Amino acid sequence: VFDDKLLAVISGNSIGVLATIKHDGRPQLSNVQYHFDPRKLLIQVSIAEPRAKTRNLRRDPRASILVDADDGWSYAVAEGTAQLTPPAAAPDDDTVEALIALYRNIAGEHSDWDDYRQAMVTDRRVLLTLPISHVYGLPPGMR
Amino acid sequence: VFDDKLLAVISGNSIGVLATIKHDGRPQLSNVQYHFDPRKLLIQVSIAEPRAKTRNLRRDPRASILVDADDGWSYAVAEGTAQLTPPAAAPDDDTVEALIALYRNIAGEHSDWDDYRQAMVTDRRVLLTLPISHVYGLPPGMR
Ligand SMILES: Cc1cc2nc3c(=O)[nH]c(=O)nc-3n(C[C@H](O)[C@H](O)[C@H](O)COP(=O)(O)O)c2cc1C
């Protein structure tokens, strides 16, 4: 039941710190917006192919994400192995579809889906699906 | 030469996400308090002596700390090779004396130093010094 406390932190937020592994083995850090699927215990995020974090995950898919509790001090960290889609290549391909689904979960119903599809392709957007294999941290009550 | 806008972020905060390298190569994350010396350009944090997977810090001290800005997405990341003191073993050893100065830098004059001293020994506290090698991130704008 202790993991339920760590999952709750992840569920109560939409932004976290994604840590990837550089070519030299050193950690690389950045923040990302995300959607947490409690059903499959997945964390879904959108990223760009040319970005460092993306090139890192292509060589080494291991990833972790730290998320702060609402007190801004307590936290939970999800660790797992990323599953990336190829980059959007056409406004109607499967990657763009999964990204349309994510956007709905993050921001809601987009206004100009056609413009969105165009943008996903222009930015070579990739959907990062990170199944949670292990969670650690210091959830509220422990800090 | 680092981006002054990125250093301002670090100097305007006191907590961030520390990332060290575990044995398997995965980063180990946590929310920590830090002190930033803007002249010597270094960051100092207090940590229990690492055990198990986290112990790898002793042979591969490369670390990074991400610090959040006050706006929506801005953040800075300080990268460097950490130097570690030996773990605190005596309420009055060099390490504890060093952690007292760290506490003063971060919080100020402590109520009861004798409690602090024994607490440092009890947690096998180590003073980690991260001289800044590289600084990256997303700089905040005029606000
Ligand atoms: C207006 C705005 C919207 C953003 N939206 C997202 C987003 O939807 N998802 C995400 O993961 N990051 C988002 N970001 C931030 C980037 O992910 C972040 O700056 C990035 O991690 C750079 O990574 P890199 O250093 O690995 O290239 C946004 C930033 C801004 C300024």
Swiss-Prot record, chains A, B:
Disulfide bonds: none annotated. Keywords: Oxidoreductase. PANTHER family: F420H(2)-DEPENDENT REDUCTASE RV1155, HEME OXYGENASE HI_0854-RELATED. Belongs to the F420H(2)-dependent biliverdin reductase family. GO terms for biological process: vitamin B6 metabolic process. Its EC number is 1.-.-.-. The keyword Protease does not apply. F420H(2)-dependent reductase able to catalyze the reduction of biliverdin-IXalpha to bilirubin-IXalpha in vitro. However, kinetic parameters show that it is less efficient than the biliverdin reductase Rv2074 and suggest biliverdin-IXalpha is unlikely to be the native substrate of Rv1155, which probably catalyzes the reduction of an alternative molecule in vivo. Binds coenzyme F420, but does not bind FMN or other flavins. Cannot use pyridoxine 5'-phosphate, pyridoxamine 5'-phosphate, pyridoxal 5'-phosphate (PLP), the anti-tuberculosis drug PA-824 or aflatoxin analogs as substrates. It comes from Mycobacterium tuberculosis (strain ATCC 25618 / H37Rv). The lineage of its organism: Bacteria, Bacillati, Actinomycetota, Actinomycetes, Mycobacteriales. This is F420H(2)-dependent reductase Rv1155. InterPro entries: F420-binding_dom_put (IPR019920), F420H2_bilvrd_red/Heme_oxyg (IPR052019), Pyridox_Oxase_N (IPR011576), Split_barrel_FMN-bd (IPR012349). Homodimer. It is an enzyme of class 1 (oxidoreductase).
